[PDB]
């Protein structure tokens, strides 16, 4: 099973499960630990921002790869936005400082 | 061709600044603003940048000096 881009999950703008929805591979938490133990910070960042969750980032990355400019504009993953709106949906005010 | 990066790591060190300087230089080649400094051997710009680092032709100091001088000559 392989995948470059495909359908994305509804609430969290992330790829889907395995090979029946043509979905991606889960780069779970332990894989993140392995990347952290290496120095691979751009690998990790692209793995969890442009390859998974950044809605605007992944389209820009697709376009940039199409014209041979292997650079990314990482951006903020959508799942963190969901978390912020969910903590705010409780009576808790969570915001980003120094806007 | 490229198998290991031990001469480039030697010449720059820290095993992390090598990645950053090689990425800067490979992007310089990839965008039509620079040309290789070593005979291209059908390599990708990442490997070409590493091979330039090994030769000593590229450093973080060389790159910023060249950027500065390009800025200065842009005035003309």
């Amino acid at each position: 099973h392989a995948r470059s881009t495909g359908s994305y999950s509804l609430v969290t703008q992330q790829p889907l499960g395995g090979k029946a929805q043509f979905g991606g591979q889960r780069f779970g938490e332990m894989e993140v630990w392995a990347l952290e133990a290496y120095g691979a910070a751009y690998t990790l960042q692209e793995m969890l921002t442009v390859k998974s969750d950044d809605v605007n980032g992944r389209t820009k990355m697709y376009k940039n790869i199409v014209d041979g400019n292997h650079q990314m504009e990482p951006g903020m993953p959508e799942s963190f936005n969901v978390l912020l709106k969910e903590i705010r949906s409780l009576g808790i005010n969570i915001e980003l400082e120094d806007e | 061709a490229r198998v290991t990066v031990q001469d480039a790591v030697e010449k720059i060190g820290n095993r992390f600044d090598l990645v950053l300087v090689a990425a800067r230089r490979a992007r310089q080649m990839q965008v039509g603003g620079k040309d290789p400094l070593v005979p291209e051997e059908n390599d990708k710009t990442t490997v070409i940048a590493l091979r330039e680092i090994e030769e000593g032709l590229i450093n973080n100091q060389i790159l910023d000096v060249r950027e500065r001088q390009e800025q200065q000559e842009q005035e003309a």
């Binding site: 120095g39 910070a41 751009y42 | 992390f16 990645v19």
Partner: peptide, 18 residues
């Protein structure tokens, strides 16, 4: 702030403490 991003983070501090 660990690996190849450590430098980046340091640079951010260079701009934050000004």
């Amino acid at each position: 702030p660990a690996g190849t991003g450590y430098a980046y983070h340091q640079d951010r501090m260079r701009r934050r403490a000004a």
